[PDB]
C-alpha cells in the first residue's frame, strides 16, 4: 500500500517524519546548539528513505550522515557516536548473563549442533558469580568511543549470531576479563574498570578468543625450519597452517634451505632453490585466513644475505614480471649481520654461498660469524662473489619500489637480548618487535598488551608517572595469567612458552601524549620525556615480574641470563638511566628473587587497536594533520581534533580553514594564519627530519628489551637519505633498520 | 694454431677429413649401398665443424645428420642408430661389474660424501655373481633400438656421473634384473634375455630406481583425504609431497571437502571452498618434481558432480580469466554416478549440495546412492538446484576447450571390480587405469609392466598365443617379486600394498600387431583378434597368480571377493568368453587354491615406454601416417615405416610420395596411387569412426579387471558426437568415458 516502514518490533507504520527529529534532539543533550542542527541530518536521511525499510537502516544512515557532517562542527562526532551506540544499546540485551547463556546455548541453524561461542567453564564462572559481576558493569562508558572506532569495533570484533551482532561492548570487555581472570573476581573488576576506562587494551587475538571454545590468546609466533628436507619443509608448512588457523602471526626463518643447483643425494638431481617453495607459502598465505576470515593470514620470510638465492629473493615481491616468479602476498625481510654492513661500507666483495656446502652458519653471530665466514671465504668453497654495493643497490631498488624487504640487524639483536644463554636468535615475528629464540623443538610464542598514553596526562600538563607503573603491574599480572590459560595450536609451542615464558607490552599514541603535554616533537622535553616514560614502564615491568617471582619462583632457564648476572638492558646499550627512579633496590630484589618473565617490553604497531581507541599508531608522528575517513559514498577529510581544539580557542579557525589545509596536505606551516607554536606542536612527519626520530629510537629502544617497529617516512626516492639512514641506524645501535619505506605520492 | 680437434683420448690433431668417411663406411655394413652415401653426411657434418671441437660432438652431429637424411632412404635410421650406439659403446666400460663398483664408489665432487648410485646389497649380489652374469650379457642387442628411442632413453634414463653418461643400455637392463631378482640368478637371466629381447618392459620408476639406494619401483598412487580439517588437508599435502618426491603418480579423491559458505564451528567463519585449496595443490605440483627433475610432478583431482563447487571446479583449468582463480598445472576429473547420467538423459533437475550438510555420501554407490541422494533431495537440505543439461553443457565446454575433465563412471567401476568387499572405490590414478580401494588408512599403490605385442607376430602372419601367456607368467612373477622389495615413501602405503597386493599389466602397440597380422582396424578379425589376445593375457595372468597362490597362499583379504565366489571379470560383463581356452580347470584350481594378486590387468598409456621401443601408444591407432620428429634445427616428417615397407615392395613408392602425403596429413586414401588395401590397413584415426573403437573397448575392457586409457580423437567440436559418444560409452558399460578430447588444428 502506502510508504510503510518496518518498525524494529517487526511491524509496519506510515512514514511520520517528526519521529526522527523527535529522537535526534533527544540524543543531542549537552552539545553546542549553535551548530547542532537536526534538520540537515533529517533532510539527508529522507533523501535516502523509501518504502519498506527497516528502521535500523535509518539509524545507521543517521549516524553516517552525522559522521559526514562532522566537518562543520566537531560535536557531530559526539552526536554520531551517540546515535550508533544508542542504536546498539536499544537492540541487544541488558543483562550479561543471559547473553552468555544465549551464546553457549547456540545451535547451528541448519545442522542442529550445540556449537557454543563460549566454553562451559566460562559460563560456569559467570553463572556462579553473575550477581556481583552484573552489578560491576557500567554502560555509561560505551558513549566514549569515536564513531569510526566503534564501527571498526563492530564490524569484526563483536561476536555475531547469524549475522546480527549480539554483544554490547561492555559485554565484550567483561567477557575478556572473565576469559582471563578465571577464579578471581576482584582482579576481574579491577581489570574490567582499568580496561573499560581505556587505560590499556589487549591484543586482537585476545579480543577474538577470550573465554571462547578455542582459547588462543597469543599473537606472536616465530617458526624456523625443522629440516632441509621435504619432511621438514612440509611439516613446517603444516605448523604454519594450524597457527594461521588459530589467528596468529607467523615469522619464518628460511635461512637453512639449500640453494639453486646444489646436488640432491636422494634422487640424483639438483634443487630449484627457494622461489617455488616461497610460491607454495604464497598460496598457503592466501588460503588459510586468521580466524573467521577476520584478517588474511600473513607470513614473514626472513633470509640472511649470504644465501645464494638472494637476488631472486629480492626480486620476488614486485608488480611486473612473470607470475610464476613472484610471491607477493608475503612479507619479506633481511636478517643482516655486520659483515654485509662493513663490506657495503668499504666497497669490498661479498661471498654468496650455499648452506649445504657451508653448514651451520646462521647459528653463529658476531666475531665468530666473522671468523667462520672468513674461513669459508678462504677455502674457495663459496659459489658466487658479488660486489657488496651492487647488492645494496638491489636492496634500495626493492625498498624503493615496494618497501619490502624489512631490515633487521643480526649481531645487534643477538648481542642485546636476555636469551643469549640459549643460542642464536634466528628470526622475529611479522611486525618485527618480538626477538626470541627459535629452534627445531621450541616454537616461539609471545603475548601482547598495548597501553595507551594520553589517558595518563593530567590537567596540569605534567605527566603522571606513578600511575603508569601501577597499571603496568596490573598488565604484567594479566599477561602472566594469560600464558597459563592459553591453548597452543601446536605441541612445540607449549614447551617454549612455558619454559621461557615471555610477555610483550607496547604503547600506542605517543603523539597525543606530546600534544597533551604541549611539547614539540623534536624538542628537548620530548626526548627527555619518552626516555622518562620508558624508564617508568621498564621499571614497573621489572618490579612486577620481580613480585611475581617472589611468589612463584623464576622461570625454568633463569640462571645463566645476564639479568642473573646483574646486567639489565640499559647496560647492554651502555647508557646509565636518569635519577628518576631507584634502581639499586630493584637490582637487589632481582638479585634475591629473580624475575618471572624473560623478555618484557615490545612496541607493536597496533593498527587496529589504535583504530579503536582513536590514538595514533604507536610511536610515529601524525602522517598529516588532515586524515581521511572511509564512509560509504563519502571518503573525506577530517583534521586532527587536537589541532582543531586549539584552533577554535585561538580564534584563527574559520569556515574555510579546512580548505586552506587541503592544498598543503596537512602542512599547517604554509598558511599565513599562524601563531608559530602550532608549527612546532603539530609537525607533519614529512616535515620532520628522520634522524632526530632515529635518535629518539636509540634512546627509547635503549630502554626496551626487544625490538620496536619503525615506519620510515621519506617523501621522495633518494639514495643518500636511505643509505645514510640505514648506516646511521646501525651506528646508533638499533635492532631494526626499517619496517616500511613510505613515500607519499 | 691451426684447426685442431680434441680427440677423445684428450689430445689434439689436425683436421683430416677421411677419418669420417673412413668410419662411416665401416659402420655401413649390411645396408643398401645404392642409397647409403657417406659423402652427404660428411658434407653436412663439415658444415658445422670448427676449431677446438671434441670429436664426440662430431659423432653426435653425424648421427643427427643421418637422422635428418632418413627421409631419402629408410636405411639411414639403421645407420644413425649404429652411429649413436657405437658412439656410446666406444665410450664407457665393457664390464658391468666395474661400472657397478664405480657407481657405488661415487663421491660428490665438492662434498666428499660416499653418495652411491646403487645400494650395497645390489653390489653384493653383483660381486658375488659377476662371473656368470658378465657372461650372460649380450651387447649385440643394443643396435636394435630406434634412434629417437635411443636418444629418449639416453637423455633421462641412463644413470649419469657428473653429466657424462656412464651406463650402456644392457648395463641398465641387467641392473634392473639384479635390482628385482635379488638372490636368484636363473630368473635374472631369463628375465634379462626376455627383457633385452624387447618382449616386455617395466614402467619408468622401475627403470629409475631398480637396485638404487632409494628403491621406489612403484608408479601408481591413489590418495584420499584423511579429514575435512586443516590437519587432514595439510597431512594429505605432506603425503603427496613425499610420494611426488619418490617419482610416483598421484590421484586424489577430493570429494569430502566442504563447499563455499558452510559454517565453520571452530572459528565462527565460512569456508572459501575448493578453489584456493586446489591452488595450493597447483603450486605443490609445480614445486616437487618426480625424481631428479626427470618429469614434472602431476596431480589428478577427482570430484563427484554433486559437490557445490562444481562450476568453479570446471572453470579452473583454462587459459583466460584471473590468475588467482585458475589452477592449470593439475589434471581434473569427474567421478560421475549414474544419476547425473539419467538426469542429463531426461532433462530433469540436479541437486548440488555440501558434504558437511549431507555427510557420508561418496562412500555409497549405485541404487543405495539413488536412495540416499533422493532422501537428501526430499528434505530440502540441498543448497542449489541446477538443470542437468546446463551442467552437461559446462562439461562439454570444458572438454571442448582443454580436454579436461576426464570422465569416469562411479557405479560402473564400483560394480565391476574385485575389491567390492572392502567398500567403495573413491578415485583412480592420474592416467585413469588403476581402480583400487582408498581409505584414511590404506593408500593405494600399484605396480606396472607393459608388454609389447608386435614381437609376438610370427612370419606366417598368424599370431602366437602360447608364447604370450608364458611371458605373462614371467611378468607376474616379476611384479610379485617387486612388491616385496619396494620401499614405500609413506607408512600407509605398505599396509595396503601388502594386504591386498595388486599388480598391473598393460600392453603397448596394438596397431603394429594389426599391421603385422595384416588386418584392417575395423575388420572382423581385429575385433576377434584383440578379444582372443586379452583372453590369452587374462588367462595366463590368472594361471600365474594361481600358481603363486599354490606356493605362498592367497592374500590376506581373499575370502569375500567374487573370485572366491567363482565370478570372474567376464561374468560381471555377462560375456561368455570364446572356446579358445579351457576355463573350467582354471576355475577349479582357483577354487582350490585362490589367487595371489587381487587386480591384474591394466592398460596404461605408455608415452615414454612406447617412445623407447618404437611401438605406438598402447591401444589407439596411429594419429597420422606421417609423424614428426624433434631434431635440433630439424623438426620434420617421417612416414610410418610399415606403410613405407609395403610401398617400397608394391612399387608405388617414389621420390615425391612423401610430398604427396604432406598436403593430406597422413590421409593416404586421397591419393590416386592406391591399391585400396592400404586404405584399410592404414586408416588414420581421424578417418576412423569412434564408436567402433568404443565397441572394441567394450570387448577388450570386458576382459580387463581394471579400467583402461581411452584417447578420444575428434577433428571438430560437435556436441552430438560428444554427447552420444559419452552416452554410448555408458551404454556399452565402459569404466572410462574419456581420457582426452583431442582436436587436430
Ligand atoms: N514511522 C516512521 N517512519 C519513518 N521513520 C521512522 C518512523 N519511526 C521511526 N523512524 C525512524 C526514526 C529513527 O531515525 C529510526 C529508528 O526509530 P525507532 O523509534 O528507534 O524504532 P522503534 O520505534 O522500534 O524504537 P522504539 O520502539 O524503542 O521507539 O527510524
Ligand atoms: N624432487 C625434488 N624437487 C625439488 N626439490 C627437491 C626435491 N627433492 C628434494 N628437494 C629439495 C628439498 C630440500 O631443500 C633438499 C633436500 O631434501 P632431502 O630429502 O633432504 O634430500 P635427501 O636427503 O634425499 O638428499 P640429501 O641427503 O642430499 O639431503 O632438496
Ligand atoms: N683427426 C681428426 N680430425 C677431425 N675429425 C676426426 C679426426 N679423427 C677422427 N675424427 C672424427 C671421426 C669420427 O666421426 C669422430 C670420432 O673419431 P674417433 O676415432 O672415434 O676418436 P678416437 O680416435 O679417440 O677413437 P679411437 O681411438 O677408438 O679410434 O671424430
Ligand atoms: N582459517 C580458515 N580459512 C579458510 N578455510 C578454513 C579455515 N579454517 C578452516 N577452514 C576450512 C578447512 C576445512 O575445509 C574446513 C573445516 O576445517 P576444520 O579444522 O575441521 O574446522 P573446525 O574443526 O575448527 O570446525 P568444524 O568442527 O566445523 O570442522 O574449514
Ligand atoms: N596484518 C596483521 C598485522 C599484525 N598481526 C599480528 O599482530 C601482532 C601485532 O600487530 P597489531 O597489534 O597491529 O595487530 P592488531 O592488534 O592491531 O590487530 C603482530 O606481531 C602480528 O603477529 C597479524 O597477524 N596480521
Ligand atoms: N606425466 C606422467 C605420466 C604418467 N605418470 C605415471 O606413470 C603411470 C603410467 O604412465 P606411463 O606408463 O605413460 O609412464 P611412462 O612409463 O611412459 O613414463 C601412470 O599411472 C602415472 O602414475 C606420471 O607420473 N607422469
Ligand atoms: Mg520509536
Ligand atoms: Mg637430506
Ligand atoms: Mg680413431
Ligand atoms: Mg572440524
Author numbering:
A (entry chain B), B (entry chain A): -1 to 743
From the publication, what sentences describe this entry?
In the class Ia RNRs two homodimeric subunits work together to reduce diphosphate forms of all four canonical ribonucleotides (NDPs) to their deoxyribonucleotide counterparts. The larger α subunit contains the active site and two allosteric regulatory sites. For class Ia RNRs, dATP binding to the cone domain at the N-terminus of α2 has an inhibitory effect, whereas ATP binding reverses this inhibition.
We obtained a near-atomic resolution structure of the human α subunit of RNR in the presence of 0.05 mM dATP, 3 mM ATP and substrate CDP. Based on the lack of enzymatic activity under these conditions, this first near-atomic resolution structure of human α6 is in a dATP-inhibited state. Thus, each α subunit contained one CDP in the active site, one dATP in the specificity site and one dATP in the activity site. Six α subunits, organized as three dimeric units, make contacts through their cone domains to assemble an α6 ring that resembles the overall arrangement seen previously in lower resolution crystal structures of dATP-inhibited human and yeast α. The largest change is rotation of the cone domain by 20°, which is necessary for the three α dimers to interact with the requisite geometry to assemble a closed α6 ring. Density consistent with Mg2+-dATP is observed within the cone domain close to the subunit interface, where the nucleotide effector makes similar contacts to those reported in crystal structures of human α2 and E. coli α4β4. The conformation of loop 2 observed between the base of the dATP specificity effector and the base of the CDP substrate indicates that communication of CDP binding preference from the specificity effector-binding site is conserved with E. coli α2. We find that β2 access is impaired by the 60-Å constriction at the surface of the α6 ring and by the disordered C-terminal tails of α that extend into the ring.
